[PDB]
Amino acid sequence: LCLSQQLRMKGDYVLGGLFPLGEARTRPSSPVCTRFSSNGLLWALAMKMAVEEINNKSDLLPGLRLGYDLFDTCSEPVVAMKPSLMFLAKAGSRDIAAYCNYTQYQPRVLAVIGPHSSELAMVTGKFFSFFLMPQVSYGASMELLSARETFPSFFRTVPSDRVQLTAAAELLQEFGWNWVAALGSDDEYGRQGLSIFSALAAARGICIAHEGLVPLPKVQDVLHQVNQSSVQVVLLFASVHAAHALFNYSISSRLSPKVWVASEAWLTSDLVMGLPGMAQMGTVLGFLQRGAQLHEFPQYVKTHLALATDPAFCSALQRCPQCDCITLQNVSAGLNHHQTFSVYAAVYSVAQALHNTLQCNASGCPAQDPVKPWQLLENMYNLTFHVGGLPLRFDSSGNVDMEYDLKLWVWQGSVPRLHDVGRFNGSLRTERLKIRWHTSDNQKPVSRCSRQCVRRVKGFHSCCYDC
Amino acid sequence: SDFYLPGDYLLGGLFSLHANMKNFLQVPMCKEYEVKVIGYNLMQAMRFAVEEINNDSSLLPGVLLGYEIVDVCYISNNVQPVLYFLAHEDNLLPIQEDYSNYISRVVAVIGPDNSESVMTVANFLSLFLLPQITYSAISDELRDKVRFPALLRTTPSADHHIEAMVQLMLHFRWNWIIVLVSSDTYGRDNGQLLGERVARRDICIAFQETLPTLQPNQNMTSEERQRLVTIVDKLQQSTARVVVVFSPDLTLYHFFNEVLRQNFTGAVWIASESWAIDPVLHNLTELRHLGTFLGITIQSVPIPGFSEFREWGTCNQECDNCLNATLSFNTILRLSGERVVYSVYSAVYAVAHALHSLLGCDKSTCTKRVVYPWQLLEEIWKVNFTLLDHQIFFDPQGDVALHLEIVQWQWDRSQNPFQSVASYYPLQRQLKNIQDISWHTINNTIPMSMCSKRCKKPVGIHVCCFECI
Ligand SMILES: *[C@@H]1O[C@H](CO)[C@@H](O)[C@H](O)[C@H]1NC(C)=O
Ligand SMILES: *[C@@H]1O[C@H](CO)[C@@H](O)[C@H](O)[C@H]1NC(C)=O
Ligand SMILES: *[C@@H]1O[C@H](CO)[C@@H](O)[C@H](O)[C@H]1NC(C)=O
Ligand SMILES: *[C@@H]1O[C@H](CO)[C@@H](O)[C@H](O)[C@H]1NC(C)=O
Ligand SMILES: *[C@@H]1O[C@H](CO)[C@@H](O)[C@H](O)[C@H]1NC(C)=O
Ligand SMILES: *[C@@H]1O[C@H](CO)[C@@H](O)[C@H](O)[C@H]1NC(C)=O
Ligand SMILES: *[C@@H]1O[C@H](CO)[C@@H](O)[C@H](O)[C@H]1NC(C)=O
Ligand SMILES: *[C@@H]1O[C@H](CO)[C@@H](O)[C@H](O)[C@H]1NC(C)=O
Ligand SMILES: *[C@@H]1O[C@H](CO)[C@@H](O)[C@H](O)[C@H]1NC(C)=O
Ligand SMILES: *[C@@H]1O[C@H](CO)[C@@H](O)[C@H](O)[C@H]1NC(C)=O
Ligand SMILES: *[C@@H]1O[C@H](CO)[C@@H](O)[C@H](O)[C@H]1NC(C)=O
Ligand SMILES: *[C@@H]1O[C@H](CO)[C@@H](O)[C@H](O)[C@H]1NC(C)=O
Ligand SMILES: *[C@@H]1O[C@H](CO)[C@@H](O)[C@H](O)[C@H]1NC(C)=O
Ligand SMILES: *[C@@H]1O[C@H](CO)[C@@H](O)[C@H](O)[C@H]1NC(C)=O
Ligand SMILES: *[C@@H]1O[C@H](CO)[C@@H](O)[C@H](O)[C@H]1NC(C)=O
Known part of the structure; x- marks a missing residue:
């Protein structure tokens, strides 16, 4: 199919690429992943489309060709460490020096489009921060990546977990539920979410009745503890598997209805959405991202896959050997994926930062020595770049800012569907006159603790009082 | 060099x-x-x-x-x-x-x-x-x-540290403790591990509060002043008198200065391995009035x-x-x-x-x-x-079976600054050979940290809390 030959393209300023193209040792050998993944290939095609259309553009990066070196990294970081080291090696050589600091390096890649997985993103960011390589990531959302003390050169295009956790805390505060129970997955994602939410609650006056962890497929004990307190609101900041397992077990035990606050991980997932009997467990109030999508991306994918089969094109023109023996049906499912826009916007952001750094104007680019990767960081913070006509900005802490949509599960014929009941844009606004609750009548569930009264302190952080 | x-x-x-x-x-x-x-x-x-x-x-x-x-x-x-x-x-x-x-x-x-x-x-x-x-x-x-x-x-890993803490807690019959963690990942993981280990051994946690990151020798924001005041006030109000602190040895200076200012006395502080052997922190010598300090560290x-x-x-x-x-x-x-x-x-x-x-x-x-x-x-x-x-020798998981030890801070510059009172053997997960401990009580009696005197209807989430009937 000669798709792998297109994973590398020369140019004046090549870019990096770390994608989950493939999935799954007594010797120091890099493991090879043979199984093929459609999501990684779709994201790689998205970045390739972004770079090619940027080269097509005249007023952006005029007279310069933008390259890319797409690399297959499995979910493991051991396989992904080698592409980063190959990134930081000097152009034309396979050796990376270990100098005193970053100023003595001349890396072959201007920037890096970081990994989708957040743990891999942490590893690669901690590696690149020593060389001050500007790395922008798609899909990495865990919060501690925003610490500019230890990640001076890590950006992203998806909102961090702090945004959705602050939205959930504002929802809890506005509706008046100041007696809530918080849960999370045993993985790093849930633990980080819980750690941020405890601080957010303590700042906002709410605090947790019971802060537990639901293990991935124990849960019985966690449900018992949650049931012990008279708490009608439960924030389940968990991955899909943990949320599905908890809901299945609670169905088996016939748990009473509660108001579940959902993270983006399982708010829209069809594994829990299609779980039979889920309708008898209260309204699910979650926050969902409000972002655009690459309208022409499916057309690009289909035309590119049709053209790559032509032997003449391949003659005219490995990282992913499994990527060769594929068909359009093996990637047709994930065509309408949100992360494709995230990758497209990340590539556009790096291109705009490069255009600003060279101080190019519409007619052309002034001639000078190549710009070093660390010189981008000045113009990457506080940068405004237009993606598809929609402006975006990088925060001083390196996270993009975007709105959120507050959705709830409206049950109809055992097929729940989402509905707009609020919009978070830094200050939550809700329309509670159209929310259908789960109680006997359409009345808001009450989960409130008295902070003043005879008193007996109750709560995980000792906030309330059992007057 | x-x-x-x-x-x-x-x-x-x-x-x-x-x-x-x-x-x-x-x-x-x-x-x-x-x-x-x-x-x-x-x-x-x-x-x-x-x-x-x-x-x-x-x-x-x-x-x-x-x-x-x-x-x-x-x-x-x-x-x-x-x-x-x-x-x-x-x-x-x-x-x-x-x-x-x-x-x-x-x-x-x-x-x-x-x-x-x-x-x-x-x-x-x-x-x-x-x-x-x-x-x-x-x-x-x-x-x-x-x-x-x-x-x-x-x-030994944190599993053995938490086990030693729980064994010492059960030996002296304390089932009402206060856990403090730091904002960093280490404190959070250790606090979660201690909570999970202790929840199944009939010992309840009164509350868990997180100390803000505050390096010493710096001017800290009034928000952190209010947070520390609130934490110490909650410590004083609570009836628990066994505080377990899971934080790096650097961020405890401001917290202990605040506790000293508030004149909060009569607790059995239990240290993690981070500061159980910290000499610069132990040099303060004005913490003798805060009670007795213990800590978990490698056997001498x-x-x-x-x-x-x-x-x-x-x-x-x-x-x-x-x-x-x-x-x-x-x-x-x-x-x-x-x-x-x-x-x-x-x-x-x-x-x-x-x-x-x-x-x-x-x-x-x-x-x-x-x-x-x-x-x-x-x-x-x-x-x-x-x-x-x-x-x-190395376990299948790359650990060495070295005995842990609970040390009690005793202030005497002519003697050992970290007296050893108990020895923990990771191989059998048993804490033994507990010796004399110089408590802070009036007649050298074991400090009592129980949320309910022995009698039975329960009150509150915690099983160990109830009112006698
Ligand atoms: C770039 O423009 C050429 C014509 O100059 C066109 O054939 C190609 O499809 C364009 N590529 C895009 C839009 O990615
Ligand atoms: C980087 O190291 C070199 C070694 O010659 C030194 O001269 C320079 O000041 C250093 N730059 C820094 C630390 O920013
Ligand atoms: C949960 O709590 C309710 C109310 O106290 C009680 O009826 C029920 O038995 C408890 N247990 C379960 C498993 O639902
Ligand atoms: C749901 O819980 C039941 C009862 O424990 C168990 O038998 C079943 O395997 C669970 N289902 C899944 C999909 O985990
Ligand atoms: C393409 O799809 C077919 C049919 O499902 C599958 O057998 C094959 O492995 C796929 N190719 C890959 C995953 O490279
Ligand atoms: C734009 O850059 C080109 C290339 O250096 C330069 O000749 C030109 O004067 C600049 N300004 C305009 C307005 O074209
Ligand atoms: C840089 O940030 C400041 C403060 O947020 C802002 O006023 C300014 O417009 C920014 N500069 C840009 C966007 O070029
Ligand atoms: C956020 O939304 C509110 C209404 O909910 C609106 O009044 C405000 O201007 C918005 N702020 C921004 C920065 O867009
Ligand atoms: C042995 O080591 C000691 C310090 O441990 C050192 O003073 C001495 O030079 C070494 N060699 C001999 C032969 O003593
Ligand atoms: C240590 O201090 C002494 C005086 O107390 C001084 O003579 C000596 O040079 C110092 N050594 C250093 C600063 O390395
Ligand atoms: C702030 O720092 C200065 C300079 O070290 C110090 O003298 C002072 O005590 C600190 N605190 C306040 C409240 O000014
Ligand atoms: C202890 O500290 C408190 C709090 O500042 C202070 O009011 C009190 O005078 C101090 N001394 C005694 C003996 O309580
Ligand atoms: C220990 O504290 C004493 C008493 O405040 C002080 O004099 C000394 O400098 C401190 N540090 C030591 C002995 O290292
Ligand atoms: C190490 O050697 C000692 C002494 O011979 C023996 O008791 C012990 O079992 C050995 N350990 C292992 C893991 O073989
Ligand atoms: C302490 O013990 C002594 C000696 O047995 C006894 O006389 C005294 O009353 C005790 N004090 C208290 C407060 O129990």
Whole structure:
């Protein structure tokens, strides 16, 4: 199919690429992943489309060709460490020096489009921060990546977990539920979410009745503890598997209805959405991202896959050997994926930062020595770049800012569907006159603790009082 | 200098010589931070181990064991040292698909002293399978060898620390405790682990509060002042009198000053391994009125001639104030014995014995063959010897069965600043040999921390809380 030959393209300023193209040792050998993944290939095609259309553009990066070196990294970081080291090696050589600091390096890649997985993103960011390589990531959302003390050169295009956790805390505060129970997955994602939410609650006056962890497929004990307190609101900041397992077990035990606050991980997932009997467990109030999508991306994918089969094109023109023996049906499912826009916007952001750094104007680019990767960081913070006509900005802490949509599960014929009941844009606004609750009548569930009264302190952080 | 000793085989050493005790274009070198005496003491321990190894004609005869000690900050700089260890003598690191035939500058590395930098170093070295023996790293995340094939250890994990805490808690019959964690990952993981372990042994937690990050010798924001005031007020209001603190040794100064100001007295503070042996914190001497302090740390083993050895004595590899800073701590360090120093000693001796077996020499000339790092890693799992009348061998998960110990801080400059009261044996997970403890109570009676006098209807979530009927 000669798709792998297109994973590398020369140019004046090549870019990096770390994608989950493939999935799954007594010797120091890099493991090879043979199984093929459609999501990684779709994201790689998205970045390739972004770079090619940027080269097509005249007023952006005029007279310069933008390259890319797409690399297959499995979910493991051991396989992904080698592409980063190959990134930081000097152009034309396979050796990376270990100098005193970053100023003595001349890396072959201007920037890096970081990994989708957040743990891999942490590893690669901690590696690149020593060389001050500007790395922008798609899909990495865990919060501690925003610490500019230890990640001076890590950006992203998806909102961090702090945004959705602050939205959930504002929802809890506005509706008046100041007696809530918080849960999370045993993985790093849930633990980080819980750690941020405890601080957010303590700042906002709410605090947790019971802060537990639901293990991935124990849960019985966690449900018992949650049931012990008279708490009608439960924030389940968990991955899909943990949320599905908890809901299945609670169905088996016939748990009473509660108001579940959902993270983006399982708010829209069809594994829990299609779980039979889920309708008898209260309204699910979650926050969902409000972002655009690459309208022409499916057309690009289909035309590119049709053209790559032509032997003449391949003659005219490995990282992913499994990527060769594929068909359009093996990637047709994930065509309408949100992360494709995230990758497209990340590539556009790096291109705009490069255009600003060279101080190019519409007619052309002034001639000078190549710009070093660390010189981008000045113009990457506080940068405004237009993606598809929609402006975006990088925060001083390196996270993009975007709105959120507050959705709830409206049950109809055992097929729940989402509905707009609020919009978070830094200050939550809700329309509670159209929310259908789960109680006997359409009345808001009450989960409130008295902070003043005879008193007996109750709560995980000792906030309330059992007057 | 003392950061470099040439020899046939090198031995990388990562130590925390400085800490952040108070613009991304410029990188502040670790030499500008305040000097940490503990890191210099541990480096001196490693150097003493190497020199004693070189002296002996029985262990590694005819091979000079050299080392390239470099300064690693607690978090700040933990990438350049690894890049420098992995490079050749020309400071160039080749990139290739296979590293079987690659020989690096150092044959093994004595890892950093905290979990996060240890994780970073292991993630970087997993490609090369360079053996890395960390000391005083307690994270349970390093136990598994799927993602850390080349990581070993010489201290019991956090599981044994939490077990020792719970066993001490049950021995004196306290079932009502207050847990404090720090905002960093280590405190959060340790607090969660303690909660999970203690929830099944009929001991309840009154509440858990998180101390804000507050490095000493700095002007802290009034928001942090209010947070600390609130935390101490909650500590005083609560009826629990056993406070377990899981935080790095640097961020406790402001908290303890606040507690001292509020005049909160009568609690049995239980320390984690982070500050259970902190000499600069123990030097405050105004915490004697806060109650009794305990802490969990490695069993003391007297290393002969280490105190006299300490007294006689590229980039990010030189510190000058360390000597004049550690001179003032000579007496307390000498009297406190050797707890983590023995961990470093054992790590170096384990590497030496692995190299001795790999070279296959016995009391005579060695074969002096080329040694790849992965071969040394393969031969290091099987080390087994008696070091200072202790047994050193590695579990299937890369841990050494070293006894823990609960120490009670007693303030007497003429005696041991960290008196030992109980010994914990990780092999059977049993805490025994509890000795006399100098309590803070009026008649030296055991402090009582129970939320309910023995009688039965329950009140509140916690099972141990009820009202007698
Ligand atoms: C770039 O423009 C050319 C014509 O100059 C067109 O054939 C090609 O499809 C364009 N590529 C895009 C829009 O990615
Ligand atoms: C949960 O709590 C309710 C109310 O106290 C009680 O009826 C029920 O038995 C408890 N247990 C379960 C498993 O639902
Ligand atoms: C749901 O819980 C039941 C009852 O414990 C168990 O038998 C079943 O396997 C669970 N289902 C899933 C999909 O985990
Ligand atoms: C393409 O799809 C077919 C049919 O499902 C499958 O057998 C094949 O493995 C796929 N190719 C890949 C995954 O490379
Ligand atoms: C734009 O850059 C080009 C190339 O250096 C230069 O000749 C030109 O004067 C600049 N300004 C305009 C307005 O075209
Ligand atoms: C830089 O940030 C400041 C403060 O947020 C803002 O006023 C200014 O417009 C920014 N500069 C840009 C967007 O070029
Ligand atoms: C956020 O939305 C509110 C209404 O909910 C609106 O008044 C406000 O201007 C918005 N702020 C921004 C920065 O868009
Ligand atoms: C980087 O190291 C070089 C070594 O020659 C030194 O001169 C320079 O000041 C350093 N730059 C920093 C620390 O920003
Ligand atoms: C042995 O080591 C000691 C310090 O441990 C050192 O003073 C001495 O020079 C070494 N060699 C001999 C032969 O004593
Ligand atoms: C702030 O820092 C200064 C300078 O070190 C010090 O004198 C002072 O005590 C600190 N606190 C306040 C409240 O000014
Ligand atoms: C203890 O500290 C408190 C709090 O500042 C203070 O009011 C009190 O005078 C101090 N002394 C005694 C004996 O309580
Ligand atoms: C220990 O505290 C005492 C009393 O405040 C002080 O004089 C000394 O400088 C401190 N540090 C030491 C002995 O290292
Ligand atoms: C240590 O302090 C002494 C005086 O107490 C001084 O003579 C010596 O030079 C100092 N050493 C240093 C600063 O390394
Ligand atoms: C190590 O050697 C000692 C002493 O011979 C022996 O008791 C012990 O079982 C050995 N350990 C292992 C793991 O073989
Ligand atoms: C302490 O013990 C002594 C000796 O048995 C006894 O006389 C005294 O009353 C005790 N004090 C208290 C407060 O129990």
